Amino acid sequence: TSVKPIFSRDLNEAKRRVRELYRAWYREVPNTVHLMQLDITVKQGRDKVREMFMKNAHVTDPRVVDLLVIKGKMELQETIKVWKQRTHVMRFFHETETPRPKDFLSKFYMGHDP
Amino acid sequence: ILPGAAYTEKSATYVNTEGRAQQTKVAVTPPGLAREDWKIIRALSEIAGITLPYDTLDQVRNRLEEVSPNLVRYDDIEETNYFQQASELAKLVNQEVLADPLVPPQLTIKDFYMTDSISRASQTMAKCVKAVT
Amino acid sequence: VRPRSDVTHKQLSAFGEYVAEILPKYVQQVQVSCLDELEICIHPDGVIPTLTFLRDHTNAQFKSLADLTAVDVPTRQNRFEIVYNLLSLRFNSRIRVKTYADELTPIDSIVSVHIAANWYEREVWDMFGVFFFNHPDLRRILTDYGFEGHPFRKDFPLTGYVELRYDDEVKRVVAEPVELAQEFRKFDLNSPWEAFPA
Amino acid sequence: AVIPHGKGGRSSVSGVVATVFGATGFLGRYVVNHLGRMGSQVIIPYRCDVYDIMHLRLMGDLGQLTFLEWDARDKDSIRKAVQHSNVVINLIGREWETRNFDFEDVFVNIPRAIAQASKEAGVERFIHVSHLNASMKSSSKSLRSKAVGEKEVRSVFPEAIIIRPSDIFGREDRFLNHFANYRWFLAVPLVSLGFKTVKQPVYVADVSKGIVNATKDPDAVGKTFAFTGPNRYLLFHLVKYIFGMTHRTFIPYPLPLFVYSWIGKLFGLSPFEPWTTKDKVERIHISDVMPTDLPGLEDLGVQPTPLELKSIEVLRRHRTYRWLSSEIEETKPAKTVNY
Amino acid sequence: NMTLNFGPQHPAAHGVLRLVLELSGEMVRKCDPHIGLLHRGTEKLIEYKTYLQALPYFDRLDYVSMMCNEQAYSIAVEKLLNIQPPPRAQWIRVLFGEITRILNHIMAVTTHALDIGAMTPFFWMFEEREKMFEFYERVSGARMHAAYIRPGGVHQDLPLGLLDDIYEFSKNFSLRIDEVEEMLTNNRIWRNRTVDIGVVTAEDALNYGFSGVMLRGSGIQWDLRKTQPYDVYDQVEFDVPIGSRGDCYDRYLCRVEEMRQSLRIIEQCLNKMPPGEIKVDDAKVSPPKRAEMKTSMESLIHHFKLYTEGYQVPPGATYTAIEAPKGEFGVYLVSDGSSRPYRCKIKAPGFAHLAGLDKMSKGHMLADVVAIIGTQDIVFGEIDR
Amino acid sequence: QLITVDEKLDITTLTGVPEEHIKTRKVRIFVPARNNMQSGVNNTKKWKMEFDTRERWENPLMGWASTADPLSNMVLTFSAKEDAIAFAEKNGWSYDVEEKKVPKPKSKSYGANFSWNK
Amino acid sequence: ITHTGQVYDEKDYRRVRFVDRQKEVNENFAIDLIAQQPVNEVEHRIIACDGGGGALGHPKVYINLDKETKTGTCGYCGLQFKQ
Numbered sequence A: 001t002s003v004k005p006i007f008s009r010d011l012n013e014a015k016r017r018v019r020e021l022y023r024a025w026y027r028e029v030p031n032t033v034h035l036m037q038l039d040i041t042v043k044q045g046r047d048k049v050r051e052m053f054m055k056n057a058h059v060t061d062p063r064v065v066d067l068l069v070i071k072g073k074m075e076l077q078e079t080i081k082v083w084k085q086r087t088h089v090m091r092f093f094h095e096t097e098t099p100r101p102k103d104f105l106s107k108f109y110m111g112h113d114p
Numbered sequence B: 001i002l003p004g005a006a007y008t009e010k011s012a013t014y015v016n017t018e019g020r021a022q023q024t025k026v027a028v029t030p031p032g033l034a035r036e037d038w039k040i041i042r043a044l045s046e047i048a049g050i051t052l053p054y055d056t057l058d059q060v061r062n063r064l065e066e067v068s069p070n071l072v073r074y075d076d077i078e079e080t081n082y083f084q085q086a087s088e089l090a091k092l093v094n095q096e097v098l099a100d101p102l103v104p105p106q107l108t109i110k111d112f113y114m115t116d117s118i119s120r121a122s123q124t125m126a127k128c129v130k131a132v133t
Numbered sequence C: 001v002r003p004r005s006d007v008t009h010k011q012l013s014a015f016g017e018y019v020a021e022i023l024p025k026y027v028q029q030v031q032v033s034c035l036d037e038l039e040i041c042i043h044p045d046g047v048i049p050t051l052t053f054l055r056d057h058t059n060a061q062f063k064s065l066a067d068l069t070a071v072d073v074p075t076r077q078n079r080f081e082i083v084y085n086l087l088s089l090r091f092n093s094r095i096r097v098k099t100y101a102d103e104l105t106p107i108d109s110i111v112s113v114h115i116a117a118n119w120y121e122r123e124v125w126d127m128f129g130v131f132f133f134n135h136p137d138l139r140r141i142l143t144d145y146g147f148e149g150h151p152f153r154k155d156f157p158l159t160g161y162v163e164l165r166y167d168d169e170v171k172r173v174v175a176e177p178v179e180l181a182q183e184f185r186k187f188d189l190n191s192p193w194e195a196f197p198a
Numbered sequence D: 001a002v003i004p005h006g007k008g009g010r011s012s013v014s015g016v017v018a019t020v021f022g023a024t025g026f027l028g029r030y031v032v033n034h035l036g037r038m039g040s041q042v043i044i045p046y047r048c049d050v051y052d053i054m055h056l057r058l059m060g061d062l063g064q065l066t067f068l069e070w071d072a073r074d075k076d077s078i079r080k081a082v083q084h085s086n087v088v089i090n091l092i093g094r095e096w097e098t099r100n101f102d103f104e105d106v107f108v109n110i111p112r113a114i115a116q117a118s119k120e121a122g123v124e125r126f127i128h129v130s131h132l133n134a135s136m137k138s139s140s141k142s143l144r145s146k147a148v149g150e151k152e153v154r155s156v157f158p159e160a161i162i163i164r165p166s167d168i169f170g171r172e173d174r175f176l177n178h179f180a181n182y183r184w185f186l187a188v189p190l191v192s193l194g195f196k197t198v199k200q201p202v203y204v205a206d207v208s209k210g211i212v213n214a215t216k217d218p219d220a221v222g223k224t225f226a227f228t229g230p231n232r233y234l235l236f237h238l239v240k241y242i243f244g245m246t247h248r249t250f251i252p253y254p255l256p257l258f259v260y261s262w263i264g265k266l267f268g269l270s271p272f273e274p275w276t277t278k279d280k281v282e283r284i285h286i287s288d289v290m291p292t293d294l295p296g297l298e299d300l301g302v303q304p305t306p307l308e309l310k311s312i313e314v315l316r317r318h319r320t321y322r323w324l325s326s327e328i329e330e331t332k333p334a335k336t337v338n339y
Numbered sequence E: 001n002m003t004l005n006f007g008p009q010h011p012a013a014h015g016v017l018r019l020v021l022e023l024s025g026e027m028v029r030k031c032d033p034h035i036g037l038l039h040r041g042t043e044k045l046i047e048y049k050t051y052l053q054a055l056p057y058f059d060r061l062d063y064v065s066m067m068c069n070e071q072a073y074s075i076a077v078e079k080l081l082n083i084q085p086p087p088r089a090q091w092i093r094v095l096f097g098e099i100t101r102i103l104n105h106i107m108a109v110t111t112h113a114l115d116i117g118a119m120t121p122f123f124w125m126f127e128e129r130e131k132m133f134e135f136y137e138r139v140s141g142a143r144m145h146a147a148y149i150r151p152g153g154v155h156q157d158l159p160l161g162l163l164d165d166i167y168e169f170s171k172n173f174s175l176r177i178d179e180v181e182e183m184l185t186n187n188r189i190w191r192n193r194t195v196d197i198g199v200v201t202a203e204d205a206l207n208y209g210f211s212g213v214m215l216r217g218s219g220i221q222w223d224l225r226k227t228q229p230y231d232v233y234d235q236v237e238f239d240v241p242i243g244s245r246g247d248c249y250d251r252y253l254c255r256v257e258e259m260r261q262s263l264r265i266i267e268q269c270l271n272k273m274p275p276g277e278i279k280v281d282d283a284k285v286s287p288p289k290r291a292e293m294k295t296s297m298e299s300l301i302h303h304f305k306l307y308t309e310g311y312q313v314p315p316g317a318t319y320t321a322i323e324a325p326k327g328e329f330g331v332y333l334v335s336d337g338s339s340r341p342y343r344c345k346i347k348a349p350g351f352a353h354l355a356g357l358d359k360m361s362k363g364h365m366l367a368d369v370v371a372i373i374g375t376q377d378i379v380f381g382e383i384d385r
Numbered sequence F: 001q002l003i004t005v006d007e008k009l010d011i012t013t014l015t016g017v018p019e020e021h022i023k024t025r026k027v028r029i030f031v032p033a034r035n036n037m038q039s040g041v042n043n044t045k046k047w048k049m050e051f052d053t054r055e056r057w058e059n060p061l062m063g064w065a066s067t068a069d070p071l072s073n074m075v076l077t078f079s080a081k082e083d084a085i086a087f088a089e090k091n092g093w094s095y096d097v098e099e100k101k102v103p104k105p106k107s108k109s110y111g112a113n114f115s116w117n118k
Numbered sequence G: 001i002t003h004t005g006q007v008y009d010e011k012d013y014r015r016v017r018f019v020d021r022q023k024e025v026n027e028n029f030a031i032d033l034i035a036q037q038p039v040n041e042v043e044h045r046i047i048a049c050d051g052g053g054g055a056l057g058h059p060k061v062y063i064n065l066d067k068e069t070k071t072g073t074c075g076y077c078g079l080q081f082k083q
């Protein structure tokens, strides 16, 4: 315990920042899908932002959350500008890779080490 | 034929004679389509429909804990034993020891070199066996 | 045998006390190595103060920042060991000030003290993940735009987790989990026999 | 056989050595893609120049793809290609019967010799490909011939999986690009004004995965799967929709198929890959057969993918300076006519 | 403020640099250089390699200056071991150290001109370069990427006859530098595109850590080779070419002058190179001679252990900086007692110089940016590492 | 002022590891034993934690070993058992520590074996 | 075929490679070449074996041709020496 704070004293304040970033991405998804001529649906894209945002929903550590948005914001900038060309963005969608089943029987049938 | 693995190829547990449970670590991934012994049986149970509860090995280690203690605690011999009650039941049992002398099957060292499966399948053990013979 | 000049070992030692007295507050350890180099060690809070004194003190002008780096000792609670190597064109001498930073306990930025650090601090964030407060524009410099993970951390796999190839179906470059065709052979090299320290 | 080891991606092994004769073309580009992705050993016979076959090299790990020189009028070439393959996939087809190869050859004659040898070799399975709705009495010499062959292929390699796909759309597709390519003709000549022309389009990828899956699936033997699609369409909406995404005006103009078969003849006359052909025209205005009972893409594991979803990628090149920035969801998707 | 990526594949931009630029009119409002287009992992890879098998990485860090870089790691590993190279090896390293400086300056001055638009100087001096490479090859075996300067001296004595040829060349190279001057030093046009472009103050140059000709060009007198002598650069006599009115033209003149001064240092090295051995005699650090390892047991054991395992440097850390042709090249090599290093941050004269592009090219035209990237001798290998 | 958190530093969210290799990877903290071949004990001093071994299939073209597991060759070295356990907890990898086993003191004396008695 | 008789087989899925391109194998296999080497007779109990040429040979080893029963074979050259 006894840990110095980064940008938020408590998860509460931190959550404020997450809200802002969500908004940022939400407002940005449409633009990217147009400035990068990405073949995705804005609704789909915002879903992705949601997924990525949610993937880390479990965290309850004020300090960890603050870094997470710092990092998140940085990603936004890159995407806001065209620093991240489409190849970079679409990677988020994991479009080419073949999905792996998580069913035990499925894995048994395919991989030595699951 | 449902091929399995060998102790070089699985994170299984064994226990020697004074009950010290010990853990084999996977040195090499199992060959061919061959799979870890515990999973073949968990999978057969799923095809059968009486699925076993564990689905990961930590879970099977938790299973071993409910049926037996040594299995989960490694490198730890179990101190107390109950010899006195064992004798009482031995006293109840009545049996005849036949006059035939008791003889160890491994009378001389050629007896020793090939015993288990891996041993029997050994070209080095086979070379050793013919050297003795 | 290297041509050691004790004349130096002494003068730099004397400066090491000088600094230790001048800033009792942040200097934790000071030592002049047998390699004739001084390595003041400061509490992370003393980043701004200790540097500034060295950049702007008549008896210790350390104008240029040679380098800012972060060794990562995973065992050490404070994983990173930010090391700042500084030069004095006036006294023809050098000193290294090294602090300790953990993954989520950021260090102050010295872009104010030396603007050379604007880039190296971005380099330390990208590779090791230490964060620098008050940095003008901290953002990945060396790694790919979408890279996930800080690469020079000792806990990051050399080959990494993603590699790129062109896929016709999608007519675009596409990451895939790394699949290597000859894994890095990890030769064990340490010898079980030590060398009696001189 | 080859025990399948690995994690599943490139540089892994799946144990499918497969000759794929028509890899050079549109669908082949996709068949080799998955086969290579999976890690299968792929032998690609080729008679096109090495420069053209290069796009194939990039797909697959070092040593996965082997290219062999092969001539259709030479039985020996097919013989050595299938020597060491255990799966043979046949995609040989054309729309313009050429001077030295007529529809029979490309569809029935050649695809027979191939499977014939494959058996001699002892390949586990053969997957011939013939067009969907290739009735043995259809209008297009092509469809007639393709059916004729499927009859023969069953004799040589009994139970060689056969897949009859519906119109196939994907970047570099004919079905989707060709219509978009009628722009030169200010108006668009369509029999029955583009109506009376129900068709179901299938993305190239959909067809492929199915084909690949067919090789690694036991049920496929002696089957005639027909990869169809996720939605049918009267040719009218299709044509307009296309023009819609292309953002180019549409003037569907009625023109007798009688006279039009003649227009196809005209292009057919052209020496360099006629832009259109008597047959293609008939095939165009040939409606697609009903679902019938034949199994489908999802049966082989690949759930069909709606046309509108990926249409944007196929038709994008045909847009203009600004139209190039429009996306499908602000655009209006055309109605689905099952009829 | 029009945004534009100078582009990775730019005929002018050395190597691959994405210089996102916002250009008001033709003037460049902002310069945000992007880096890492050539990051390759050189610093992490070294941690997994032994000291001698990490020596080839240093040649690749900035390969215009192939060897001078190797000397910096050498020196660093020698310090950690407290071993110093034999006298002949030291002179060699200064001999090939300087030859390498010329090679870098011929690269920097002629490549600068090619971007400016003068193309004949490059062909004139690349022929001289070529001739120098041949020295490398006949000494190391490789035209560039030699691996000749190893941590305990050089690898093999000079071939029997090289010195004489490093003379014939040196005896003439001057005229070749002279010819270029004629065309550029005073071209009525070189001056314009170079003079008063990218002026850097003296205080600002020290502040942004420029440490190279870039400092020397602004009039700050600092040559690590005179201030902190390394090897036997102390026994030679040369004049640092300091500059005033620091600008692209002045620094250039400085680089042409060090080409001149290096010929003065090379001459001496040929005149005074001592008879002796070229590698430390401690089989502990330097590999045993092949006749010895094939006839003496202690030598085989030392050959086997050195090649298979390694030096086993004593635990410590050092920052050793030389004066690589670009500027201060330093290796901070932290080392556990193990045979493989723990960290090896390479200070690249170039990470600091690029950063200055922003503070140098302000209110400048697109062509000015091209001139300034040239006056920093940016080799993306050292910056990206 | 400092803030209070009882949450075990878990930074699994910042490390940047793919989900599969954080939840399916068991690492063992062990002090390396000594190759019986040599009698030196300088490699049995520091604790090391090593990730679980994974697939090493043969490569078809050249027969070289091929691995799909990134964390295979990585063995981090930690000076003390407590510090190594900490690394596993904050990085989220499962751990199973093995106690150091050091040779027991053995009494030896050249005179003792000269005893004809025994 | 080759030294250790590599024989991608009639059923292997790799013999596919040589189709239309030959395999790399060796004539004058070494396995038989030293066997073709005469036994170096010697007078001394022990003999050296620089490999021939000193520095251009193998680390010098001394072989004990002490038993005619066995011709010492330097582990490096495979040269049998006949006491």
Ligand SMILES: NC(=O)C1=CN([C@@H]2O[C@H](COP(=O)(O)OP(=O)(O)OC[C@H]3O[C@@H](n4cnc5c(N)ncnc54)[C@H](OP(=O)(O)O)[C@@H]3O)[C@@H](O)[C@H]2O)C=CC1
Pocket: D021, D022, D023, D024, D025, D026, D027, D028, D047, D048, D072, D090, D091, D092, D093, D094, D095, D101, D106, D129, D130, D131, D132, D164, D165, D166, D167, D168, D169, D174, D175
């Ligand atoms: N998308 C479609 O239009 C549909 C296609 N199909 C079937 O799917 C298969 C693949 O379609 P698609 O790729 O578009 O067809 P393509 O026109 O692209 O040709 C497919 C392959 O067949 C080869 N080929 C064609 N003619 C000959 C010949 N005379 N001798 C040797 N090889 C030949 C081509 O190689 P090369 O060009 O180098 O000769 C090419 O690699 C076809 O056979 C077709 O019958 C079925 C339904 C719809």
Ligand SMILES: [Zn+2]
Pocket: G049, G050, G051, G058, G074, G075, G076, G077, G078, G079
């Ligand atoms: Zn020999």
